[model samples]
Target chain A: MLPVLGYWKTRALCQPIRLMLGYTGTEFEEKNYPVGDAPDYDKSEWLAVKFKLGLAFPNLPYYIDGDVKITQSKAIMRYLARKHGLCGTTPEELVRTDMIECQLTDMHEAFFTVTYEHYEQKDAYTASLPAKLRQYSDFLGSRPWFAGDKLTYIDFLAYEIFDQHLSLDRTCLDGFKNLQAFQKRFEDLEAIKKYMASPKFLKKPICNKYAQFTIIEGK
Target chain B: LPVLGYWKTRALCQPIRLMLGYTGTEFEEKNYPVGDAPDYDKSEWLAVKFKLGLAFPNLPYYIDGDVKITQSKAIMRYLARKHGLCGTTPEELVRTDMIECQLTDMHEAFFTVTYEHYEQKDAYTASLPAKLRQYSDFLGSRPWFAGDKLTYIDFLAYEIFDQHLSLDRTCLDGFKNLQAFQKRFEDLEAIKKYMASPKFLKKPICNKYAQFTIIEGK
Candidate 1:
């Protein structure tokens, strides 16, 4: 049986997992829970089975492979990365991975705050984004990837985060050449190239319907 | 010698401190004290924040020899790797990682309520049992979060449970297993000594501006 990945139909947290499965050429199935149209934006589809899935914490963005069931996006990614040797190898690489993983998590939470709860402050948020991007650019610092030369699971997350930010402000990456190159490098991967061009690719609606700046329709 | 840096609060750094104590690792602290209200100035930490050679400077950073790390979880995981406290098997690793992430969410929820949503304390308090019951059910009969062996995540779990208990004295009254887990943690030899020592930080769980702040002996 194929491993099962469950999350909202949107591409916010689950897209990186999909990218990982695609990059590894691993066959899996997705249980995309669709949120109802606005006003209530009903989530009964997921709420109905939230507790029946046998998950310890019972959250979305869960991965279940036979006997192994896991939630938490990074946890699921780490499990998959361990199986594929995509987790960092050296002690230095491991430390780098740990730092960047938590760093991205912090940035993602801030981004979510602006998109969901503080959309009225979008301009201020956008104004402050480049300084944050500069830190990432400096951290990347001509290295081929966030965790140095070798590709690791964090690159998948980095790519998704940078891509989502680009959707928010097309010129956000204008001054950061390294980040732009990093984006191009990720998309140029043979596996990713094919996956992005395929019908199964999910490229829009970066968040659910409730988000103020959701990309409801487009490439 | 390793150096752990953070504010002079027990908020996020206490777990790393507890882990360091548990492993009997000799380390020093660089605590940045926040000033009093009406101003509540942060110039003390701000004065040297970026000059510390941190790639991404933030509170609760850990520096050991040539390795410098920030972000509380990252720092804890780095030490866990060094001390063999990360779970040994793949199953244990997955379980620890899952619980670590869950605890992060719970910590943030508590932070939101204490720091920003204190007006909604009643609503948040009303929503505690269901959340804590999930943790109780997850623990089940295991002696530790990662089954029989103690992991770095147990430090995180203990800090969070302790903080919640401080918020509402009866928060864990219904969950006997969780209460037992707390007692079991404090009973560890090193932890027992650390709590008794002068180095233990048992007050001011939040900064001065927070809606609720726990003071010493209050």
Candidate 2:
């Protein structure tokens, strides 16, 4: 079995694997350790922490696939996507998949930067968040899915992101009707629905939690 | 609102473009010049869903309908799974992930040597050998970057080599595995076909030593 492990608090990073594996009809061990409770970075059991190749910077979401261990959120996703056929059927499919992935890479920052910067001042950050949301809403407008007309990874990401904290803005999400539709299509997936139903976890509110880890040099 | 593949033509934007190509999905790429400042509103461009939660992190982001995502590799991985760029087995998936992260590191090094330090001096050229050698050594170990298969990483790596070597055959000669990989990778009709097609990114990727359009544009 391929070893799949990560957490929501770790950043909803693991959800893609869960959805991918489920869609591919594959199964693996998924262990979501609580914040600050995992094996130490210096510990050998944690292959990622010890690797000198500079693999294990920000700790959470590390995966040990057979002998191979790695970190970095995208790295983990690519790893799983390739194994499960979640990437795409043809070379072009794969490239388009990456395109969807790349877009999210940019859009997600709208919130990450705001959240980190505004963890200090919620109102200021919250205010900034809407414009970014609007930006994303524009992208999603009238489209069936990110890659267009398919249940691509972007759809699942959109679904989970909308549920960010489960009490996120209905307006922010509401603007993108296409996305709301996309999320519904993904929810129809049995495994995703199952995963959502089960117990999930979150990391310490972005660092008060994010900062404690003394891993990578620059971040 | 996020159409996926934000910040095309930037440092971390390639994988998504390649993924889009791989998936056979049609997309529109938007280009933004980072240095073209003041006049353009940085704050407006900075707007994204991630701002609400301080999550997703970093630019070169994506929008899937309303949902916004970030981190180039993660987005690629997520999409790969949903589609089929993922491998035949779970183990393959894990290995693929491991290899991709290393590739990202190579990119980071490329950025540092080529851009951060290249402007000040010629560090990118100086550091090129060691970086290529290490990558060659790594590629040499596996039948492919993530074992023997035409996974998305393979295509991604192929483009990376293009960025580093360009027309200079000698630049890649030092890394025999890389040369072999590049040769083998290019031989694959998918990449070659893409190259032959009018749609391949005609623009040069910004590896460390390579020229920066920012400089050329001005």
Candidate 3:
């Protein structure tokens, strides 16, 4: 049996893992728990089995492969990354991967804060994108991936973050040609291109239904 | 020689400091203290934040030789790698990584209450035991967070549990294992010595401007 990747049926945290799975061509089954719609936004589907999964932390975006039951999206990603040699090799590459991973986590959390809790402040948050993007742009500079020439798991994370921002504002990356090219390069990967075109690809509803933005099917 | 930088508080950097002390690693600290209240001027840190050659500059940064790292977890992992404190087996690795992320989430929630959502303090405090129960159960019968090994996550666990104890003294009353874990951590010769020494930072768990500050004996 293939390993099971479980989470809400949203692209927020699980997409990067899914992308990485696709990239590695790892056969895995997704337990996409569908969160109930508004008024209550019920989580019974997940709450029912949340504790039964035998996960130490018992959170979403968990992975179960026989005895290896894991939660925390970052941990799952790193687990798979280690398995596939997607984690960097050299000391410098390892440090870069570690730093970028944490940096992206910070960015992702900030983005979620505005999207889910402070929807009215969308413009204010959007206005603050350039400075943040510039740091990423400068960090990437001319490298093929965030960890220099190697494509590490952090690249998957960086790709999702930049893509989510672009969804927020299409022109967000116009000023950073390198970022644009990086996105293009990522999407142009043989596996990624195939996965993106496949029916399994999740492209919309960047967040859960409760989020004030990026929930509509076509928005 | 290495340099660790953060605000003059025990909030995030204390775990790294504790780890360094436990390993007997020599390092310097650049404590950037924010100014007094009404206007908690952060110029002390802002002055050199950008000039540190950090890719994504933020505190608790660690600089050792050629490797200059920001992000508290990254810094810990770097030192853990150097000191043989990281997990040796794949299972241990997964456990450490998962617990690290879990601890990060808990820390962030606590920070939100102290730094931004002070009004939610009661609600947050009310919800503490349930969050801790998961940890207690996960840590049942284990000598450390990553099973038998004293991995880096133990340092994080100790600091966080110690901080939570300041918030509510009886928070760990129901969990015997967790209480023992705390006792066991403090009993380590290196940690015991460090705690007794002047180098150990014991107070002002939060920054000056934070809504909640855990000042020792205050």
What's the distance in Å from true for residue A172, model 1? 1.2
Of the two candidates 1 and 3, the one with more favorable DockQ, higher being better, is 1
For residues A1-219, what per-residue lDDT tens digits would candidate 3 score against the true structure? 669998877899889999999998888888877767678889887888888878878888899999899989999999989999899988888888889899999999999998888878988988999988998999899999999899999989999989998888888998999999999999999999999998988988898888888553333
DockQ of 2: 0.20
A170-194 in candidate 2: lDDT tens per residue?
4555555665666676777787667
**TM-score for all predictions?**
0.97, 0.52, 0.97
lDDT of each: 0.89, 0.56, 0.88
What lDDT tens digits, residue by residue, belong to model 1 across residues A1-219?
A: 669999887888779899999999998888888788778889997999999999999998999899899999999999989999899988999998898899989988888888877878888989999888998999899899999999999999999998988887899999999999999999999999999998888977788888877743242
Second chain only: TM-score per model?
0.95, 0.73, 0.96
lDDT of 1 by residue, B1-218 (tens): 88988888888889999988888898999988777776778897899988888888899888899999999999899989888899999989999999999999999998898876778877888889999999999999999989999999999999999998877889899999999999999999999998998888888787767877733221
Comparing to the true complex, what docking class would candidate 3 get?
A: high
Q: Number of the top candidate by DockQ? A: 1
Worst 10 residues of 3 chain A by lDDT: A210-219
List ranges where model 1 is wrong by over 4 Å. A215-219, B214-218
Q: Distance from true position, residue B69, model 1, in Å? A: 0.8
Residue pairs in collision within model 1: none
